[PDB]
Amino acid sequence: HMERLLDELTLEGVARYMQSERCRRVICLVGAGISTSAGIPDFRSYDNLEKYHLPYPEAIFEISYFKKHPEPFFALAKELYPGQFKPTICHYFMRLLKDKGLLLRCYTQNIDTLERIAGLEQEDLVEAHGTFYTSHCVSASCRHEYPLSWMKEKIFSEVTPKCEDCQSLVKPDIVFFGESLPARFFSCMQSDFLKVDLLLVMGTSLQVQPFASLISKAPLSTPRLLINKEKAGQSDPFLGMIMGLGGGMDFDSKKAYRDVAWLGECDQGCLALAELLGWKKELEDLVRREHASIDAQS
Amino acid sequence: MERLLDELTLEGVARYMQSERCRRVICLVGAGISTSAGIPDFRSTGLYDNLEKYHLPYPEAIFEISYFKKHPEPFFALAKELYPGQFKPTICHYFMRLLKDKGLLLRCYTQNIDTLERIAGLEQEDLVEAHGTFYTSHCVSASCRHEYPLSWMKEKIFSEVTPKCEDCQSLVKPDIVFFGESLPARFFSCMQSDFLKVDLLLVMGTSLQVQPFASLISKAPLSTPRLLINKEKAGQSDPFLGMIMGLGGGMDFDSKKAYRDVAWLGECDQGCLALAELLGWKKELEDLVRREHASIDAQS
Ligand SMILES: COc1ccc(Cn2cnc3sc4c(c3c2=O)CC[C@@H](NCc2c(C)noc2C)C4)c2ccccc12
Ligand SMILES: [Zn+2]
Ligand SMILES: [Zn+2]
Numbered sequence: 001h002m003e004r005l006l007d008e009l010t011l012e013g014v015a016r017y018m019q020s021e022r023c024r025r026v027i028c029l030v031g032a033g034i035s036t037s038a039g040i041p042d043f044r045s046y047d048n049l050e051k052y053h054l055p056y057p058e059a060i061f062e063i064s065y066f067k068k069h070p071e072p073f074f075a076l077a078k079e080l081y082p083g084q085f086k087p088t089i090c091h092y093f094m095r096l097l098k099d100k101g102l103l104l105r106c107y108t109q110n111i112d113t114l115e116r117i118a119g120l121e122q123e124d125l126v127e128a129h130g131t132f133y134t135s136h137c138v139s140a141s142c143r144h145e146y147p148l149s150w151m152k153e154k155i156f157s158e159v160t161p162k163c164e165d166c167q168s169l170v171k172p173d174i175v176f177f178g179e180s181l182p183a184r185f186f187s188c189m190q191s192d193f194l195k196v197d198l199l200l201v202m203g204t205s206l207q208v209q210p211f212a213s214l215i216s217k218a219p220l221s222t223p224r225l226l227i228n229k230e231k232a233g234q235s236d237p238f239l240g241m242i243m244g245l246g247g248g249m250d251f252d253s254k255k256a257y258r259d260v261a262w263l264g265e266c267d268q269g270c271l272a273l274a275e276l277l278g279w280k281k282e283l284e285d286l287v288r289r290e291h292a293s294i295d296a297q298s
Numbered sequence: 299m300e301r302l303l304d305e306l307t308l309e310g311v312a313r314y315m316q317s318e319r320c321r322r323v324i325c326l327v328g329a330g331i332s333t334s335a336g337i338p339d340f341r342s343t344g345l346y347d348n349l350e351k352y353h354l355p356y357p358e359a360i361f362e363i364s365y366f367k368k369h370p371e372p373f374f375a376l377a378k379e380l381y382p383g384q385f386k387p388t389i390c391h392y393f394m395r396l397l398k399d400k401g402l403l404l405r406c407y408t409q410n411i412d413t414l415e416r417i418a419g420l421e422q423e424d425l426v427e428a429h430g431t432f433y434t435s436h437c438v439s440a441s442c443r444h445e446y447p448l449s450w451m452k453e454k455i456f457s458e459v460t461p462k463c464e465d466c467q468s469l470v471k472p473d474i475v476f477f478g479e480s481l482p483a484r485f486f487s488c489m490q491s492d493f494l495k496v497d498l499l500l501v502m503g504t505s506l507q508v509q510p511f512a513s514l515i516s517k518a519p520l521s522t523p524r525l526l527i528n529k530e531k532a533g534q535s536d537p538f539l540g541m542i543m544g545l546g547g548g549m550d551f552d553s554k555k556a557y558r559d560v561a562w563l564g565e566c567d568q569g570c571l572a573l574a575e576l577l578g579w580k581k582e583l584e585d586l587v588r589r590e591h592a593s594i595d596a597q598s
Binding site: 085113116117118119121133147148149152288289290292293294296297298 | 384385395413416417418419421433447448449588589590592593596597598
């Protein structure tokens with residue numbers, strides 16, 4: 001009774017399916033691997049922070065520790081700022097998907113704002129771990145909002161961002177350890193995953209939540225293409241390897257029917273896929289134009 | 299005299315642009331296409347008020363090459379003051395990117411130095427920066443001429459350090475054309491090839507009073523239509539001789555012998571929207587502007 005929508009478990013099969021009338025709504029799930037070529041470190045895989053005496057390394061991303069000791073976070077943020085914020089080919093591939101009427105939603109666990117810089121708009125986006133694009137005063141009574149331009153100025157000046165109204169700490173809208181995921185994630189998830197025809201999973205190893213559990217919630221017939229440095233999503237987040245029961249990624253077993261792994265850099269996978277679709281020149285033209293627009297500032 | 303427009307209106311130009319005859323469009327653009335982006339028009343007040351302490355002989359002396367070479371501080375003081383923060387191209391800039399994407403843009407000639415054409419996605423091959431640009435800078439010494447990028451020049455201006463060459467310590471100047479300097483060599487090489495091939499001249503946001511546009515407008519082929527999108531009519535007088543009924547290729551919108559020149563008077567952004575509408579491109583243009591502006595807002 002299960003439906004077999006790919007004619008073969010290869011990138012060629014995914015491309016042919018994307019060209020079929022049945023593939024109308026694509027969801028992208030993207031992680032840190034789509035931004036390493038832009039100079040953002042692969043957080044899946046502190047040495048300058050020895051002076052800050054953190055109990056454990058992860059304490060700088062813990063909401064309670066951050067509220068009383070914010071300097072190491074902003075200091076690290078000051079350092080990890082790349083020379084220039086230029087989205088990658090993979091980012092612009094998703095913009096191409098939108099132009100062609102196939103993008104239902106891009107879910108990202110990155111906080112680097114490169115999806116928005118690439119031209120994806122809020123309606124196309126679910127920032128599942130939040131974003132630097134907006135910040136708020138931590139005081140519940142104030143909650144004054146600050147734009148990224150204001151926050152960047154404070155970080156680069158190494159001035160701990162304080163609210164201009166009440167002088168309390170201003171926090172970017174990223175999900176620290178100890179905080180809930182954005183409400184927009186849960187609302188979009190329920191509607192989106194009932195009607196998704198293809199899952200494009202790029203640059204994430206599906207270990208962190210919510211993607212770790214979300215991958216298995218696609219419809220049973222929806223094909224899932226992983227473009228990543230390594231295979232991922234084969235284990236249950238809590239039970240480990242249980243031969244894919246309950247919707248895990250299954251690329252290799254005798255029961256595989258819909259999951260495809262393309263191992264390598266995200267940029268090269270999107271170019272290979274774009275070529276199979278006849279979109280490579282259009283993608284390379286877009287990237288050249290948009291990179292030039294940003295390079296024009298340097 | 300060959301008349302290629304069916305009527306001397308925006309509608310007539312739009313029909314011509316959709317014809318096979320109109321393959322190569324040149325844009326000539328001036329300060330009027332960047333005022334809605336917050337870039338000041340020096341031809342139009344109080345820009346120099348904070349330079350009074352420098353006791354300039356005349357305000358524009360800061361842009362004359364010899365005075366700049368001995369007193370560079372006032373120019374850099376003003377540049378720091380006028381840095382807009384974010385650079386957001388206008389609808390008019392993005393209309394030219396659309397012309398490019400649609401294979402109609404032979405060339406954009408600009409007398410602006412603000413780099414908004416490049417930020418809108420026009421590449422060097424598409425551009426003739428007839429008055430130079432802030433995009434690159436050069437050591438002023440003829441025996442060195444080391445080039446410096448915009449990021450280098452920005453860091454010096456914001457640090458309030460007069461830019462000096464790292465090889466010879468001579469003064470480094472943004473590639474703006476100062477009084478007393480020749481126009482860029484690229485302008486002359488492209489002008490002579492382009493103005494032989496151009497099927498339509500689109501002139502936006504320039505008064506056609508300063509050179510090279512003042513003289514260049516009359517060098518188009520006699521049959522090539524010319525559309526002016528500007529707050530006021532321009533290009534009708536000879537740069538030196540004044541009004542001469544349009545002899546020598548001057549713009550002729552209203553005489554009984556007018557045949558190819560059209561003026562649409564208003565803001566450049568509004569005229570480009572109205573032209574895009576008549577080309578069937580308005581949705582594409584408005585989507586492009588929204589998307590690219592959202593991206594610039596995201597770069598913060
Ligand atoms: C992309 O990087 C940048 C662009 C613009 C500015 C500041 N900024 C803004 N907007 C303008 S608009 C304009 C100028 C100007 C200017 O410096 C400077 C030259 C002016 N023209 C002078 C002139 C006259 C009058 N007659 O001959 C000449 C020559 C016209 C920058 C300032 C600092 C760093 C980068 C900058
Ligand atoms: Zn506050
Ligand atoms: Zn030098």
